[PDB]
Design a protein around this ligand. Structure first.
Ligand SMILES: CO[C@H](CO)Cn1ccc(Nc2cc(-c3ccccc3C)c(C)cc2OCCN)n1
Ligand SMILES: [Cl-]
Ligand SMILES: [Cl-]
Length: 371
């Protein structure tokens, strides 16, 4: 089970694609919902995502069919296409997935943020860092639902520096474009969802607290946080979840004026990666960093909830720490940081102590020795 969210709000989920092309925006939306009696949301909604996942894991596509047998009917606890809870403007998180991931795999985070009164746009990237993604070749294909699939690109070592940087730059543009789409929907622009879904986008009119925007992301998505902040001042702060810093260009490090929070796992991090995070530091800039004791890279994504404890540890999906305990720490510390730097009038300051790593299961800063 993916956990249900700790906040007072019920949670809805839908998908938005606009336009229908490989250059349009594709996102999964999590939002405070009016109702709590809908079907739960299908977690991995297409067989081709399983084919993509099997390629990312270095197996034959036929392992994809076995993963689909084991996991293809798994749901996540969000009310599919539930009406948006009316009467309040909601702050906005744009969420960026990791390498080999896609938009639906960070529902534990997306659901928890939404249960606290956030709208969450989990983008699906078309830079070929997703395990799989889809789009429509033209208007005809979109009408009849003829999906074109785009699979993970594997790189030779000589391509790494250049291609990861091209990708992080496209990822930032995709975050900015997703922001402009949501803001235009908030400002009443008619948008026809390229997906035929029973959630009217007109509900979102006048529903965004338009100055309260953050970008959050895991791993490749953590580097996406930083590139996005340096390029788009509409984002007011960022939270990098176990950032993979390698994609970033040398130019970005001195160019991040917004508050930035690094939330790390204990076992993922390494000196080259920590050195790049420290390069973001400057006396005039707000920076915070914590490490979750006993945690692994996968504690930030939904695979940590997908299996039992023993299989979980073996597959490196779980750490020594309990998965619910770890994600509560990451989500609560995130809520307190967002309250501080977005100026929210909520009770998230009860977790201010966590921003400073003051908890038995937190390390302030990093366990990683550099120099
Ligand atoms: C969230 O995306 C991360 C971003 O960092 C990248 N990513 C993709 C797949 C993966 N890991 C992984 C997943 C699965 C899996 C696949 C489908 C359904 C359920 C599960 C559980 C299994 C069996 C094994 C897996 O890993 C085995 C090597 N350690 N990570
Ligand atoms: Cl790890
Ligand atoms: Cl290193």
């Amino acid at each position: 089970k993916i956990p249900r969210g700790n906040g007072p709000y019920s949670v809805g989920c839908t998908d938005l694609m606009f336009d229908h092309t490989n250059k349009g925006t594709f996102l999964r939306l999590y939002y405070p919902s009016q109702d709590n009696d809908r079907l739960d949301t299908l977690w991995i909604p297409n067989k081709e995502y399983f084919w993509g996942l099997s390629k990312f894991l270095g197996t034959h596509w036929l392992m994809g069919n076995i993963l689909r047998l084991l996991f293809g009917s798994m749901t996540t606890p969000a009310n599919w296409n539930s009406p948006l809870r009316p009467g309040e403007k909601y702050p906005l998180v744009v969420f960026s997935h990791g390498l080999g991931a896609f938009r639906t795999l960070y529902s534990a985070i997306g659901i928890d943020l939404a249960s606290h009164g956030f709208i969450v746009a989990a983008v699906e990237h078309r830079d070929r860092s997703a395990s799989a993604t889809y789009y429509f070749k033209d208007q005809s294909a979109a009408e009849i639902g003829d999906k074109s699939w785009l699979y993970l690109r594997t790189l030779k070592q000589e391509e790494e520096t250049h291609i990861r940087n091209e990708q992080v730059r496209q990822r930032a543009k995709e975050c900015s474009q997703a922001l402009s789409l949501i803001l235009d929907i908030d400002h009443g622009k008619p948008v026809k969802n390229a997906l035929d879904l029973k959630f009217d986008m007109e509900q979102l009119k006048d529903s965004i607290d338009r100055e309260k925007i953050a970008v959050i992301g895991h791993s490749f998505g953590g580097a996406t946080v930083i590139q996005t902040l340096s390029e788009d001042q509409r984002f007011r702060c960022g939270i990098a979840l176990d950032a993979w810093m390698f994609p970033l260009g040398d130019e970005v490090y001195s160019r991040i004026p917004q508050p930035l929070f690094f939330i790390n796992s204990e076992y993922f991090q390494y000196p080259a990666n920590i050195i790049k995070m420290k390069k973001c530091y400057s006396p005039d800039k707000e920076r915070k960093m914590i490490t979750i004791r006993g945690s692994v890279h996968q504690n930030f994504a939904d695979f940590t909830f997908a299996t039992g404890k023993i299989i979980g540890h073996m597959l490196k999906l779980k750490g020594d720490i309990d998965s619910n305990v770890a994600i509560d720490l990451s989500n609560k510390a995130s809520l307190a940081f967002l309250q501080k730097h977005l100026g929210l009038h909520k009770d998230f300051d009860q977790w201010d102590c966590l921003i400073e790593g003051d908890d038995e299961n937190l390390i302030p800063g990093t366990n990683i020795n550099t120099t």
